[PDB]
Design a protein around this ligand. Structure first.
Ligand SMILES: Cc1cc2nc3c(=O)[nH]c(=O)nc-3n(C[C@H](O)[C@H](O)[C@H](O)COP(=O)(O)OP(=O)(O)OC[C@H]3O[C@@H](n4cnc5c(N)ncnc54)[C@H](O)[C@@H]3O)c2cc1C
Ligand SMILES: Cc1cc2nc3c(=O)[nH]c(=O)nc-3n(C[C@H](O)[C@H](O)[C@H](O)COP(=O)(O)O)c2cc1C
Ligand SMILES: Cc1cc2nc3c(=O)[nH]c(=O)nc-3n(C[C@H](O)[C@H](O)[C@H](O)COP(=O)(O)O)c2cc1C
Ligand SMILES: Cc1cc2nc3c(=O)[nH]c(=O)nc-3n(C[C@H](O)[C@H](O)[C@H](O)CO)c2cc1C
Ligand code: FES
Ligand code: FES
Ligand SMILES: [Ca+2]
Lengths: 387, 198, 251, 204, 446, 408
């Protein structure tokens, strides 16, 4: 049937003009390589989502109180049925399963609903179904809290795929990041479900702040894991033993995944370098200045790196080839602006604890302007007749 | 000039003159076909706002504010006529013909002011300066922050549209529709700041 | 000739337009002021708990039951003046009547103090039963204003209404929720030592508490704004002296 | 006669074929009441401005006719603002700057210059009414969606029971923010140009 | 001296052995009509006409005075026309040795000849079509003059012949051609070459320049970009070493010299080597019994910028100096896009093939993937050494923005210059077509 | 009361703002002297205004006002005007409303350019250039069932100056006409009865003016010859109104007066030695006859010529005798005709099918060089489309085919 013949096999075509020999790479391989790069982050996110939920549940409840709670939620009683346990001594398998029962529904809903719009647009416009949706859907599914409603997820992916990408003509035509566009739609339409203390841990009745919401209140002294009463350390933040979005937590896993796609030449190291440069410079400037009241002024760069979605955005979503600048000189400025905006929104803006999404969405507007600035200098050099 | 930069940041980002208050769209969505024109147009708007807002503040405080001319008398209903006339006069001559010194400046941005003389952005800036009890203590912070935001937004839109030549928008959505969608996305991006913690 | 004709026509047009505009503007000024007064009095009556529908009803009830007064914050004692038409916001804005606060005192981030406040006494018969204190402070997105009605003992809140907040609807704008505003009735502003005791309890106040109030769900920054507002205004720098005078009796 | 008033509604819409009069059109459309009042105010101002400009185009000094028409428009807008502040205070408070910004609205100046300067008074008045109706169409059709989906109300009447009132609907936050107006206008233009292909723009 | 850092030496198998051996007998030659840019022929011959060597076959309507002549003596046997009756090729069957003869000179006199005499001799002999013009790669008009002539004494195309081996057989002819070009040049003559030694002309006008690096280093476009940037106001002329040998032989002996030395190489060639053939030879006869069995594609020129040699186009192009043969990859492979390619070539590092340095690939004509929109992962900048913005230039070309392509520098390029950009495109675009279509638009206005 | 001050303040503010604009800010560093704008390079019709204001105001004073919709500003760019004096300021927003070549050679938007220095510019004027002749009809009869010939005498003895391939403009006071009001010979009755056109009628009372080609050629003096085809409602929807002026010309009598005007035209041949080919059909016969006659009798050109005509049946071609005489007097010309609707009683089917098919199959299919000759055509739109498509497929370049908009 058509579905198999277009996905599994290679088209079996030949060159009809110009270069009679072609490079082996293609969009399918590029997108699949990106898609495979987030698997470690996905699996660790599921594990952490299960572990945090189990810890919070066993902290709040015990005995018949815990039994009534588990009997009342389908995630919990399905985990119990499938052999896992909700006891405090649950192994890694039970935590992975409990994280799966949160992640998988979101991923399936996102994929199906986005693919509907993709296929509809491609059919009506007589195109061939593209491949970047595989990356879009998984990134969107990974950058949302464990407790998103499925209808909200569907609305977000609909907005991201239709308004931001398909309206402009599909893959390679848009100028904005679709996953971030959908996340921003959710962010500004339904703030109560994607912010606060109630959404980042999937334990019923549990309410607890997160790392950046705690630093803004009390500095490094306020970083405490209320579920277990221990203090969050830099190693915990780096490994990914902290609450948050599903896939953002593990900086080690994100680095392991991103190393491959940076080595392979798919992700641009220039953008990552620019992001790091901007973040380090602005964070160190704030550290030098200091402040009597704002506790965010004293967070160092190596703490900025591991908290929030900084690593995830920098590695996997600040490097979108279509949204970024097309010139090698402009890529440095693009990354620098992204890092500067992220740190600035983190430190100075009191309304939001994180700023990666807004920073990237802002830099997407000005990347073409950096491209223009570079190309105009190139044109002047040409008119000087030395180019 | 400096009163407090939380005012400037807010007006640049969240309540942006173009992308939030919809001020100046009739030319913002039309002249943004090319970057070269938009750059000078935005610079001209910047200077006109910066000079006009404090001047209208002074005129309002000295003549049109309740009392301030004679006790028990309030001329505040002439605000619209006075503001529009002052905006028209302070440009149509006092720059259009005034800019004889600096010919390379006049041919650079002096060619764009004839279009802005009745643009709604200028009048909206003055009207905001009045509606909110600002002062010459602010003097220029608000006007400059609004003008720079307008210039930045229009230049960014022009750059985006130039980069957009590779797109394949549907025939019915070509032109005004896709421009409106792009402006909406630009505002979504621009919604990232609301204040400053020193 | 040309110049004379253009001057004449401009003269005529200006005269006609000016006459029409001035007549229209001067005719309706009193009605505009009346509309503003009605808008304020409606909220004041609603806070006082007096049922009123219609312009005539609002006017008659406000004239019958309410009595605006001016208070000097430094000594918490009444002063004589045009209490009904006072403009505390403009007084704060101006440089003569008002003062600049210091970073130590500016708990609510209001940055200036009017130096002469206006309070409304609720009267039934010849006596006084309540005093309505306008308080305001900075939230997360904008400045928030509210009226708090305290009984004549100087401790017990009879009601609270936020009438200009501008926060985020559904998340930070819940300060206007009737179910939340109904929690304040019966709470005590001060402890046995006569210091501020109102606390916006994060995660919900204990049931039956005499000082705690439930915090807004997911809006801790606006809860902090409210807490700062009440900390500043209930303190000795705000309405503290006047409230001590009220508690002394004879209001 | 009626062709002049009705054609601008959809054949030559002020905002869907040209880009005039969006500044307030997209800022005062979070409430259907404010949208309706703004539409009526624009109708009033445009009709009377066109009538008065037409009555005097024979003797108007060609050198400075812009000042004359602007003065007429400003006087009319001032009168409208006073009337709204006196009789519809609750709504006039919400409009704020955008009642005044009618002076710089492109529709009022464009119709005055292009049609009133060379048309008979009654035709100019009818043209102003028609252009006002065309403007109001977009105003009200944006306001309907924004209000309904952002607060579950129409003209303030409850239609969708909110969760905060024990209902079932959770209002959308974006509909109370600026980008929703852009998106709605764009998709409106898309639908209009799909059902009337004659208005499509050329690629070159 | 001048070092090209960016580029790509394509590691295709079947590299020729740099030794010249006599080629097979040829019975048919032809003048391809579509390889001359923007020319409208005016046929002077009809099927059955007997033609001498250097006898005019046709001339161009849009370039008055230019004459295209026969490479061999024989009979016109076929005239092929495609859609819209566009000329495809004029075929001549070799017979006899009658030829047209021209003036002679001594090696001492060449540097002092008049430009008009040189141009008349070249136009009459038909060698005037060896020159090409940047921009627009057209044959220069007879009455036009250029201030910089570029001689290409190096070849870096895949499976290309070694120019030194060929030149050392014809040192005197090469020197004479350089001397003639020195009088023609009205300026300087640039002899672009590698770091090895070549016969040298004593004239001050002639300058030798050395280029080092991967493939792009061998293109006249790169040479011009680095030594004499071209524009609408500055046009240079491009010629190659074999044409220079032909010019020298013409001005030395008074008769046209039509021999060529072309490399026959490819994955499916039994014994790659250099073969001594005639100009415009029939590839179907040249490759007879030289290839392995199966379905293969015969290309006139390198695999990067050649022309498929099928039917009416099965003849050696005038500007090509090699023949490449490789198999047709029509098969479908299950999950081929996902395999860990240990034997798959790519300019990126997502295949295992790049780990095995020195590996050589039996490449085919497959298009690895299907057409898609451009997602710029940044391959073009790896292979474009010029001082341009390749991604922006290519997007402008694809969008049809000719007026902006000129700003970004499209006037300096030729279809051979974008060959690597076409090669490494993840979207499988062909950019030579777009560049030519935009250049035609630019040229057809003024 | 006390509104006198309220009025006075507004009055004084307005008057101050107006007088400031009139007085120009107390000092202008421009020359301040009288400056001259010249039109078409001659002193007359020039304008002299002091520096200040757009060039469009000087043009309006000259009476050649140009479209300036949307208040100018480069919004749509219809204000272009050719400027002949030295170069000056050209705004960046004008550089895309005209070609890259026009961006330099004096083309500028007048609504944006301002009167600041002495200027010279060019614009067309007196475009009408009308001179007419009070021509009187001579005779009129049917050449085909839907075509009629018309002869009319000319005052002052001489023929109105004209060129082959041009058109004249004819005027007439129209009235209501009914198709029964005029008659046709018997040989056209055979289908006039079958289609029952007599029942059609039209109502008009306004004057009519239209451009029409002539069938004669310049060497004829004192007479102009032309043919007209009736505009009848299509058989697939007879309710469409008939053609008022066609019915007028078909119904009016001899001795009627119609005035010829604008005999210049806009399409003409040119002197090139290349062979020329003609194809015609129906109403298109007149321009082809004009060209053939002008080249063969008046010019007596040596270039090779040929002509094919596309008729429906024998009932639709006419005056073949003139072309036979042309072929007899000159051997470098040939005549042909084809039947697209052959009828059995015609008893002659020398050529059939559409004109383009016969042309290609008989002549061009074996022609030496189709691209080395020029083509002239006229006829029904679908014949024209077939002919041009056929020629382009045969490979003839664009410039060698000449197309007339009216078709015929
Ligand atoms: C340069 C030039 C040269 C011309 N030369 C000739 C010539 O040599 N001989 C000649 O006879 N005419 C010639 N014409 C006129 C041409 O044939 C017009 O098409 C014709 O005059 C239209 O009919 P009318 O003027 O009678 O009707 P109009 O007053 O133009 O009114 C329209 C009438 O024509 C009919 N009609 C309009 N369009 C169509 C259509 N597409 N199909 C069918 N019916 C239609 C309608 O039913 C209606 O009755 C020439 C015109 C031009 C501009
Ligand atoms: C790519 C990405 C972008 C994010 N952007 C934002 C943002 O702009 N604003 C925000 O409040 N949270 C954002 N988040 C969520 C935070 O990273 C984090 O999960 C959440 O704020 C919980 O609090 P914490 O950051 O203190 O852990 C983002 C997460 C990811 C993965
Ligand atoms: C778009 C958006 C708007 C918000 N608006 C408000 C607001 O108006 N008031 C508020 O208190 N919190 C608001 N929040 C939530 C705060 O950002 C913050 O997460 C919260 O105050 C933390 O509460 P907690 O201390 O209980 O975790 C908003 C969040 C988002 C994403
Ligand atoms: C390295 C890389 C990163 C990508 N990142 C994203 C991303 O963050 N969001 C997204 O929607 N698509 C992403 N894509 C897919 C694709 O580039 C994107 O949809 C483009 O904007 C084209 O629509 C990515 C692709 C690659 C190769
Ligand atoms: S209404 Fe047109 S610019 Fe404001
Ligand atoms: S008509 Fe608008 S610029 Fe000329
Ligand atoms: Ca204040």
């Amino acid at each position: 049937y058509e579905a198999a013949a277009t996905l599994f096999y290679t088209p079996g075509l030949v060159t009809k003009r110009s270069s009679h020999v072609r490079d082996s790479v293609d969009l399918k391989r590029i997108m699949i390589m990106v898609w495979l790069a987030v698997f470690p982050a996905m699996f660790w996110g599921m594990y952490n989502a299960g572990g945090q939920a189990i810890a919070a549940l066993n902290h709040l409840y015990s005995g018949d109180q815990l039994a009534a709670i588990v009997a009342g939620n389908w995630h919990y009683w399905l985990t119990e049925m499938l052999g896992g346990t909700m006891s405090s001594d649950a192994g890694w398998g039970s935590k992975m399963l409990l994280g799966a029962t949160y992640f998988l529904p979101i991923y399936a809903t996102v994929f199906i609903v986005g693919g509907f719009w993709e296929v509809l647009f491609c059919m009506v416009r007589k195109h061939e179904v593209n491949e970047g949706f595989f990356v879009t859907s998984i990134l969107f599914a990974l950058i949302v809290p464990p407790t998103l409603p499925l209808w909200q997820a569907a609305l977000g992916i609909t907005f991201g795929v239709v308004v931001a990408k398909e309206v402009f003509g599909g893959t390679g035509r848009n100028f904005l990041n679709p996953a971030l566009a959908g996340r921003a739609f959710l962010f500004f339409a339904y703030p109560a479900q994607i912010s606060g203390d109630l959404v980042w841990t999937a334990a019923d009745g549990y309410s607890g702040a997160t790392a950046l919401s705690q630093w803004a209140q009390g500095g490094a002294g306020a970083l405490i894991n209320n579920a277990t009463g221990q203090t969050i350390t830099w190693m915990d933040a780096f490994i990914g033993n902290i609450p948050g979005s599903i896939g953002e937590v593990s900086t080690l896993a994100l680095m392991i995944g991103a190393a491959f796609i940076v080595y392979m030449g798919i992700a641009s190291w220039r953008i990552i370098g620019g992001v790091m440069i901007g973040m380090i410079l602005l964070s160190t400037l704030f550290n030098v200045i200091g402040s009597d009241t704002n506790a965010m002024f004293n967070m160092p760069w190596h703490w900025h790196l591991v908290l929030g979605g900084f690593a995830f955005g920098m590695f996997f979503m600040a490097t979108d080839p279509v949204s970024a600048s097309f010139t090698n000189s402009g890529k440095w400025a693009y990354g620098i602006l992204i890092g500067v905006m992220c740190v600035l929104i983190r430190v100075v803006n009191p309304a939001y604890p994180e700023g990666m999404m807004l920073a990237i969405l802002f830099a997407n507007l000005f990347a073409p302007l950096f491209d223009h600035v570079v190309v105009e200098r190139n044109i002047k050099r040409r008119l000087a007749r030395y180019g | 000039m400096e009163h407090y930069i939380s005012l400037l940041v807010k007006s640049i980002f969240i309540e942006n003159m173009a992308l939030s208050f919809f001020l100046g769209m009739c030319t913002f969505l039309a002249v943004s076909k090319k970057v070269k024109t938009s750059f000078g147009l935005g610079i001209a708007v910047i200077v006109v706002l910066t000079i006009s807002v404090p001047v209208n503040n002074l005129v309002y405080n000295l003549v049109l504010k309740p009392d301030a001319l004679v006790e028990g008398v309030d001329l505040s209903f002439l605000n619209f006529i006075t503001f529009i006339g002052v905006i028209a006069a302070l440009v149509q001559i006092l720059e259009m013909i005034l800019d004889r010194f600096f010919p390379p400046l006049y041919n650079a941005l002096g060619i764009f002011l004839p279009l802005i003389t009745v643009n709604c952005a200028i009048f909206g800036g003055v009207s905001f300066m009045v509606q909110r009890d600002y002062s010459f203590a602010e003097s220029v912070v608000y006007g400059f922050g609004s003008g720079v935001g307008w210039m930045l937004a229009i230049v960014a839109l022009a750059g985006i549209r130039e980069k957009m030549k590779y797109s394949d928008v549907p025939p019915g959505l070509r032109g005004l529709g896709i421009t409106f969608i792009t402006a909406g996305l630009m505002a979504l991006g621009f919604m990232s700041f609301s204040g400053v913690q020193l | 000739d040309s110049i004379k004709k253009t001057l004449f026509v401009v003269i005529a047009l200006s005269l006609v337009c000016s006459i029409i505009v001035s007549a229209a503007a001067v005719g309706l000024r009193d009605k505009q002021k009346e509309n503003a007064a009605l808008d304020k009095q409606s909220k004041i009556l609603q806070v006082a708990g007096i049922e009123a529908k219609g312009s005539k009803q609002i006017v008659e009830l406000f004239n019958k039951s309410i009595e605006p007064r001016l208070v000097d914050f430094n000594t918490g004692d009444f002063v004589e003046g045009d209490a009904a038409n006072y403009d505390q916001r403009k007084a704060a804005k101006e440089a003569s009547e008002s003062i600049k606060l210091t970073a130590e005192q500016d708990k609510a981030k209001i940055q200036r103090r009017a130096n002469v406040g206006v309070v409304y006494l609720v009267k039934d018969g010849d006596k006084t039963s309540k005093v309505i204190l306008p308080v305001h402070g900075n939230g997360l997105w904008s400045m928030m204003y509210a009226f708090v009605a305290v009984e004549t003992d100087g401790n017990t809140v009879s009601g609270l209404t936020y009438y200009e907040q501008g926060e985020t609807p559904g998340l930070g704008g819940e300060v206007e929720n009737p179910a939340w505003r109904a929690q304040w009735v019966g709470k005590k502003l001060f402890d046995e030592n006569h210091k501020p005791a109102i606390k916006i309890v994060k995660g919900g106040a204990p049931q039956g508490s005499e000082h705690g109030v439930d915090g807004l769900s997911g809006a801790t920054l606006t809860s902090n704004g409210v807490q700062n507002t009440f900390d500043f205004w209930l303190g000795d720098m705000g309405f503290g002296p006047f409230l001590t005078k009220v508690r002394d009796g004879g209001l | 006669l009626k062709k002049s008033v009705l054609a601008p509604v959809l054949d030559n819409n002020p905002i869907a074929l040209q880009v005039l009069g969006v500044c307030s059109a997209l800022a005062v459309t979070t409430k259907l009441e404010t949208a309706f009042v703004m539409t009526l105010a624009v109708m009033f101002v445009t009709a009377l401005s066109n009538f008065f400009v037409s009555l005097i185009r024979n003797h108007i000094p060609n050198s400075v006719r812009i000042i004359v028409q602007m003065a007429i428009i400003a006087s009319l807008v001032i009168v409208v603002d006073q009337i709204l502040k006196a009789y519809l205070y609750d709504i006039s408070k919400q409009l704020s700057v955008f009642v005044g910004l009618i002076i710089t609205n492109c529709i009022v100046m464009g119709r005055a210059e292009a049609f009133a300067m060379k048309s008979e008074p009654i035709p100019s008045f009818i043209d102003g009414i028609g252009n006002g109706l065309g403007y109001g169409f977009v105003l009200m059709t944006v306001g309907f969606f924004r209000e309904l989906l952002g607060s579950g109300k129409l003209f303030g009447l409850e239609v969708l029971p909110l969760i905060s009132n024990g209902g079932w609907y959770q209002p959308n936050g974006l509909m109370l923010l600026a980008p929703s107006a852009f998106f709605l206008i764009g998709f409106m233009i898309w639908a209009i140009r799909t059902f009337k292909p004659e208005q499509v723009e050329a690629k070159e | 001296m001048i070092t090209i850092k960016k580029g790509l030496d394509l590691p295709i198998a079947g590299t020729p052995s740099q030794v010249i051996s006599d080629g097979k007998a040829i019975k048919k030659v032809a003048l391809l009509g579509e390889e001359y840019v923007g020319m409208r022929p005016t046929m002077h011959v009809r099927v059955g006409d007997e033609v001498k060597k250097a006898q005019i076959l046709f001339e161009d309507k849009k370039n008055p005075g230019v004459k295209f002549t026969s490479p061999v003596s024989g009979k016109v046997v076929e005239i092929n026309r495609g859609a819209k009756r566009v000329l495809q090729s004029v075929v001549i069957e070799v017979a006899g040795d009658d030829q047209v003869t021209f003036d002679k000179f001594e090696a001492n006199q060449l540097a002092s000849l008049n430009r008009d005499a040189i141009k008349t001799q070249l136009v009459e002999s038909g060698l005037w079509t060896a020159f090409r013009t940047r921009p627009f790669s057209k044959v220069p008009a007879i009455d036009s003059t250029s201030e910089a002539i570029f001689v290409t004494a190096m070849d870096t195309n895949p499976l290309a012949a070694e120019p030194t081996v060929v030149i050392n057989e014809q040192s005197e002819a090469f020197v004479a051609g350089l001397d003639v070009l020195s009088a023609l040049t009205t300026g300087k003559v640039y002899v672009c070459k590698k770091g090895t030694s070549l016969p040298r002309s004593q004239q001050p006008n002639v300058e030798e320049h050395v280029f080092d690096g991967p493939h792009p280093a061998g293109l006249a476009g790169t040479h011009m970009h680095f030594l004499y940037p071209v524009s609408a106001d500055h046009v240079a002329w491009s010629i190659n070493y074999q044409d220079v040998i032909a010019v020298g032989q013409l001005f030395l002996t008074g008769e046209l010299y039509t021999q060529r030395v072309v490399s026959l190489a490819g994955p499916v060639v039994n014994k790659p080597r250099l073969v001594r053939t005639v100009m415009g030879a029939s590839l179907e006869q040249l490759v007879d019994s030289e290839i392995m069995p199966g379905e293969v594609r015969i290309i006139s020129g390198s695999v990067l910028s050649g022309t498929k040699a099928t039917g009416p186009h099965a003849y050696l192009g005038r500007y090509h100096l090699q023949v490449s043969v490789l198999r047709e990859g029509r098969d479908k492979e299950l999950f081929g896009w996902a395999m860990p390619g240990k034997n798959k070539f790519s300019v990126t590092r997502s295949f295992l093939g790049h780990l095995f340095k020195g590996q050589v690939y039996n490449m085919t004509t497959t298009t690895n993937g299907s057409d898609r929109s451009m997602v710029p992962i940044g391959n073009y900048e790896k292979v474009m050494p010029l001082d341009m913005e390749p991604t922006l230039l290519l997007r402008d070309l694809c969008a049809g923005d000719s007026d902006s392509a000129v700003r970004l520098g499209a006037l300096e390029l030729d279809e051979e210059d974008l060959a690597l950009c076409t090669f490494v495109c993840p979207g499988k675009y062909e950019y030579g077509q777009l560049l030519r279509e935009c250049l035609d638009k630019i040229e057809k206005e003024g | 009361m006390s509104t006198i001050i309220f009025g006075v303040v507004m009055f004084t503010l307005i008057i101050l703002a107006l007088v400031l604009v009139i007085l120009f800010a107390k000092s202008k560093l421009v020359p301040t002297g009288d400056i001259t704008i010249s039109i078409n390079g001659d002193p007359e019709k020039a304008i002299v205004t002091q520096p200040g204001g757009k060039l469009l105001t000087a043009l309006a004073g000259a009476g050649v006002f140009v479209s300036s919709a949307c208040g100018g500003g480069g919004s749509c760019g219809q204000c272009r005007v050719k400027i002949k004096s030295g170069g000056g300021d050209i705004l960046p927003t004008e550089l895309d409303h005209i070609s890259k070549g026009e961006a330099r050679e004096g083309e500028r938007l007048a609504c944006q350019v301002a009167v600041k220095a002495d200027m010279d510019l060019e614009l067309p004027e007196e475009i009408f250039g009308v001179k007419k002749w009070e021509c009187t009809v001579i005779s009129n009869d049917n050449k085909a069932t839907f075509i009629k010939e018309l002869k009319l005498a000319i005052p002052d003895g001489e023929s109105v100056p004209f060129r082959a391939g041009g058109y004249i403009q004819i005027e007439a006071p129209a009235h209501h006409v009914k198709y029964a009001d005029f008659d046709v010979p018997e040989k056209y009755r055979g289908d006039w009865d079958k289609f029952n056109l007599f029942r059609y009628e039209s109502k008009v009372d306004e004057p009519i003016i239209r451009a029409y080609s002539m069938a004669n050629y310049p060497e004829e003096f004192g007479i102009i010859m032309l043919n007209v085809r009736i505009a009848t409602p299509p058989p697939n929807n007879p309710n469409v109104p008939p053609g008022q002026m066609s019915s007028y010309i078909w119904s009016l009598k001899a001795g009627d007066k119609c005035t010829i005007s604008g005999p210049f035209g806009e399409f003409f041949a040119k002197d090139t030695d290349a062979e020329m080919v003609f194809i015609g059909g129906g109403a298109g016969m007149a321009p082809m006859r004009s060209h053939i006659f002008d080249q063969l009798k008046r010019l007596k050109s040596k270039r090779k010529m040929s002509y094919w005509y596309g008729a429906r049946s024998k009932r639709e071609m006419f005056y073949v005798e003139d072309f036979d005489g042309l072929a007899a007097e000159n051997d470098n010309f040939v005549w042909h005709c084809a039947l697209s609707d052959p009828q059995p009683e015609d008893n002659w089917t020398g050529y059939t099918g559409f004109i383009h098919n016969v042309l290609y199959e008989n002549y061009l299919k074996d022609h030496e060089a189709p691209e080395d000759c020029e083509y002239y055509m006229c006829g029904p739109p679908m014949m024209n489309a077939a002919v041009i498509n056929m020629l382009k497929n045969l490979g003839v370049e664009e410039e060698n085919i000449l197309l007339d908009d009216f078709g015929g």
